[PDB]
Ligand binder design. Structure first.
Ligand SMILES: [Cl-]
Ligand SMILES: [Cl-]
Ligand SMILES: [Cl-]
Lengths: 681, 695
């Protein structure tokens, strides 16, 4: 069994938790009337998670989480992105502009209070945090240093309030080199086994009172109500593991047809188009370095969502994902019929036609998004400023647009040559001419092919070259700028996207209302304290054991990885698999200190049967005594379909061994200061 | 798990260690020079494969790939015994295979003294005779005098220091009995070759026929099933990790005694050049296949055939980088170097320096050979292009030799350039890719004269090729026929592609000649080297290199840890077949009847004790490219499987056995009996092969 439970559901799980070997009370993990692990697990930069392990507000999270800060901080004269960063005193800890970290102080049941002021409307106000948390000050002393959070649970049958302390002075303490921070980021993405040291260190500051404060001299290290002491005594197969964090999004109550839409449209189209994108882009990178130092981030970001989508498809083909949801659908129907309530099948019937009604539109939407809006560069082309139709002020506006479209990281080369032609050609085959943007429709109709159309653009448009643009702004015409082929391509596609959004939003309300009804029946059947809701970026806990899995026949993945695995992957002619000289030296000297396993090997990562997803990156992984033993930073591709249905024998959370973390701080960095603060075991 | 390919005579020195691993056999049960043993049951199949007799009526078990040629010959469209599989339900339905040979070892004799005296009598010696099987076997009749249906084989052992004569019975009537469908016999032929885990039912069944008196004879309608003096009982009681495993067969070739400089040549030239070039060939080829589905119709077969030697070579290089292969061979090399000085014999030291000079001597001549073979000969289709004979160049005025000469130019023309040898793919991508790299690895003065002059005259190799597909007749399948209507003698001679093929052919033989002068000093130094290694360790404790003669090896059924966190089990099941199913991939097509048995779990007494259906398993035995079809036997001498492959991690085992990675890939004999029974319904063969079962 799995699931992502609310902190209030701690009481119904403790029996099964202690059954796995947990030596903790339920009040240790959550206490509304006391200090607990709740006040030690924080949100980081909105989309990640962190944990305090200090007497002085020290924050542990992922490397790719705090990547933005380290990137800002890093230079040519001090490449922290390459060397890492290590503060040997509090005065060396660097401050970050606009960094927010939030701690939960109280979790409040507020379903009834919201349900009354709901009866008053687009039919989406009962789901949106836009309106829910606006009802917060009416119930609570309502803005000192806090933020009030109200979100929808169980499709809209529950509403909980999160009183939140919000820190704005979080300081970068330390980080490993990228060769350790994102080792294997290109091949080992969404993969197990894994040998990556994905971490980075921050600190929480508060004024003399200990309250959420802005960056100032006043600021003193925050002394937490509660923090998680680090345990470096080791981990073994079968050990109880506890993960707390802020998981982003799941779709636990998808019907048999919502799965199909999620399969045929959401993932398959993404796989199809991104596959073409990456095939071409890769080819052009292994032929001209200049392209590689630039299209790297774009290729990596695309390949990241691509591998997830085909991992999501793997659950459909091999794991019988849809059939499971169909079973669960029939059993709640059979339950409803036996009990004689009809507000269930109507909910299913309504969902079915909602998905049915928007099938053709969303396919057009995804093809436009994945195929053109993301892949094709021309979508950002400078559109005509509206006056052109002192005399008028937009000739100043369009080069401001040009030096944005053509500001930076865009290469007119590759688009022209294959990238746009390949994408548009496939888009043309998939979307009927009657349903594609008017610029593209006319373009292919006038030149016979999507190939010739793109060719016409770059031979007739202004923004096709740098020199051509300012050659043209020598004596600008107010006819050309209207009928410019690339400016029409960007405009028409954008308009088609805007149009597709509105026409499909008519199904947002019937779907959401039918879903709330459907979940309400399921919630009635299984009972709230036995059913975990979907993820909505709030504090959840999940538990399991440190266990590997059986990927296929005759193959078994272990639960723990070692430094040996790194050296087995070392390849100097691959930035992804480059091994840092000192790390290789430590491995040769076996200078692991006593951070090593019981068998002398140096631990790197381990995996557990916990249920994670979305933004649970940087989540603390705690042992049976409540002490920290690792940091979560990923999930295997075989468990991607866990966002729909948890996969017991395949889905695993990929965790950084906390002993490997300390090892880098100690044996690799030499920053003994942080070891003395973060007490291991 | 120690890793020798032992001589049958060396059984007395191994039997103590084999019993400690759980074997419940005597040495005489395995080899017996004065009676019957397992030796009389392990047969050589088609000269390059191994088989095993499993009944008193001479039933023979071997691989599917070993008996592929016979099945295809007896196949048709609805008689497609390759696709549908073949099953005979009586002795009269067993199909005849003319020319197919199977050899049973009758006796083994040491004839070292007799051979070396004959070698000493040789005036004008080439220096290659003492290692040549064809020559050494001609010395046999003067040793035996009366030599019917028998063959005499003398081969060189330990580098020419020992010689053993194998008296053999040659069977000329070997009939096809049974065969599974290709979907079973070749399951995972492309993806899973040289790979563990494996899920292939790689077997085929034959039978030995003889005359009424039991003697091996040519085909005749009055022939009867051969009754072996001994055969192997098939055990269907299962296997478990840790179980003792025995393999007897005819391993082809190993290089157990290669010095460090030889491993270097083996690495830098033999394998790495192949990896480099075949990699380019396959990179280009893959895109054309994945950009037009009307290509794989005849570029998919040429691809997989290249990816076969490619994957083996990359497993060889793996042992170099990782398994410290060269470092190990050098240590053993110095171990015997130090031993020689201690003893006071400087013939060893002297032999190492002679081997080296031969290796560094032919290094340039070797590098040019492999780059020519891999890069151009095997890679470029132009290498086969037609070339007019003496009839068009010397007797054009003879209107009878002329018509014969260029009727021969069409026979040459359609021989190659046949059935999707797409010239378009040949102009656009492949040839230019490979030739560019060839001329960048080979200095211009050391290239074929057409490629040297061709590149220099037109700038790049790319421009040289594009000329050929502009001016040659054999560029398209059109201008050919239009040229037959106007045969220019002058054009036929200097056709660019014809001169390209003729220039790479000339360089091919010219290279071979000058390398051949290194074989004699190399062999002489190797003999003097192994002589020291042999006296240092002692003959009955040191297995010789494989040379297509009967050897035995032993170990235990055990998986391995390929890399960190990953672990391969020792046994594969039928679900592994189902997990790999892909209807649109020929290799992973699952026969409906096979899946029907999976869905119903109808396995009978052939299933594992855990309810699963066994397919393959692996062992720590030591085998190579000739043990295909070798019997795998339990601790009591009973058949538990058939060997048909080995993993790429153990490719380096042909130089040094790797205990922690090298594994023999074996077909579980229960899966074999399962295919016969539950899949085919040929109950007749289960009654002949009466398996040992549980109660
Ligand atoms: Cl290690
Ligand atoms: Cl068993
Ligand atoms: Cl099975």
């Amino acid at each position: 069994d799995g699931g992502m439970w609310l902190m209030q559901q701690i009481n119904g799980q403790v029996a099964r938790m202690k059954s796995l070997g947990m030596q903790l009370e339920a009040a240790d993990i959550y206490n509304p009337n006391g200090s607990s692990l709740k006040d030690a697990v924080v949100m980081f930069d909105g989309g990640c998670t962190g944990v305090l392990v200090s007497n002085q507000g020290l924050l542990l999270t992922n490397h790719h989480c705090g990547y933005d800060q380290i990137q800002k901080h890093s230079s040519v004269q001090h490449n922290y992105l390459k060397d890492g960063f290590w503060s040997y005193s509090l005065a060396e800890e660097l401050v970050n502009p606009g960094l927010e970290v939030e701690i939960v102080d109280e979790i409040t049941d507020v379903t009834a209070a919201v349900k009354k002021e709901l009866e008053r409307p687009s039919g989406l106000e009962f789901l949106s945090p836009r309106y829910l948390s606006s009802l917060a000050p009416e119930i609570v002393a309502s803005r000192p240093g806090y933020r009030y959070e109200i979100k929808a649970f169980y499709g809209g049958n529950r509403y909980y309030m999160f009183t939140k302390k919000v820190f704005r002075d979080v300081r970068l303490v330390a980080a490993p080199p990228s060769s350790i921070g994102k080792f294997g980021s290109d091949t080992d993405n969404w993969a197990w086994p894994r040998h990556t040291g994905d971490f980075s260190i921050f600190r929480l500051y508060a004024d003399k009172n200990g309250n959420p404060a802005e960056y100032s001299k006043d600021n003193v290290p925050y002394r937490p109500k509660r923090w998680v002491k680090v345990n470096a005594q080791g981990v073994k197969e079968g050990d109880f593991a506890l993960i707390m964090g802020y998981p982003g999004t799941t779709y636990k109550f998808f019907t048999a047809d919502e799965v199909t839409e999620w399969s045929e449209i959401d993932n398959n189209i993404r796989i199809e188009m991104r596959g073409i994108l990456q095939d071409v882009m890769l080819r052009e990178m292994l032929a001209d370095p200049k392209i590689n130092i630039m299209y790297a981030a774009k290729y990596a970001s695309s390949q990241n969502g691509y591998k997830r989508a085909q991992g999501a498809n793997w659950a459909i083909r091999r794991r019988s994902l849809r059939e499971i949801k169909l079973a669960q659908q029939q059993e709640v129907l059979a339950w409803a019929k036996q009990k004689g309530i009809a507000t269930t099948e109507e909910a299913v019937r309504a969902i079915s036609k909602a998905i049915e009604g928007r099938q053709d539109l969303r396919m057009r939407q995804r093809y436009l998004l994945e195929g053109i809006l993301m892949g094709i560069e021309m979508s950002n082309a400078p559109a005509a400023d509206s006056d052109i139709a002192r005399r008028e002020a937009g000739l100043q506006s369009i080069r401001k647009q040009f030096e944005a479209f053509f500001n930076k990281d865009y290469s007119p080369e590759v688009e022209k040559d294959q990238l746009a032609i390949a994408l548009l050609t496939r888009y043309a085959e998939r979307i009927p001419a009657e349903k594609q943007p008017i610029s593209i429709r006319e373009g292919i109709a006038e030149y016979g092919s999507a190939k010739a159309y793109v060719e016409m653009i770059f031979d007739k448009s202004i923004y096709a070259s740098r020199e051509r643009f300012e050659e043209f702004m020598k004596n600008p015409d107010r006819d050309r700028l209207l009928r410019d082929p690339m400016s029409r391509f960007a405009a028409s596609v954008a308009y088609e996207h805007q149009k597709l959004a509105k026409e499909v939003a008519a199904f947002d309300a019937p779907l959401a209302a039918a879903q709330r009804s459907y979940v309400a029946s399921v919630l009635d059947m299984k009972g709230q304290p036995n059913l975990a809701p979907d993820a909505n970026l709030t504090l959840r806990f999940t538990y399991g054991e440190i266990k590997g899995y059986q990927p296929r026949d005759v193959v078994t993945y272990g639960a723990k990885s070692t430094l040996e695995g790194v050296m087995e992957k070392e390849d100097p002619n691959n930035w992804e698999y480059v091994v840092d000289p000192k790390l290789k030296a430590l491995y040769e000297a076996k200078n692991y200190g006593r951070y090593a396993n019981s068998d002398g090997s140096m631990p790197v990562n381990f995996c557990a049967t916990t249920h994670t997803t979305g933004g649970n990156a940087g989540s603390p992984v705690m042992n049976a005594r409540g002490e920290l033993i690792g940091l979560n930073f990923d999930r295997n591709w075989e468990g991607v379909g866990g966002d729909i249905e948890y996969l017991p024998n395949y889905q695993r959370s990929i965790i950084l061994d906390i002993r490997y973390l300390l090892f880098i701080i100690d044996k690799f960095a030499g920053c003994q200061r942080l070891i003395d603060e973060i007490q291991p075991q």
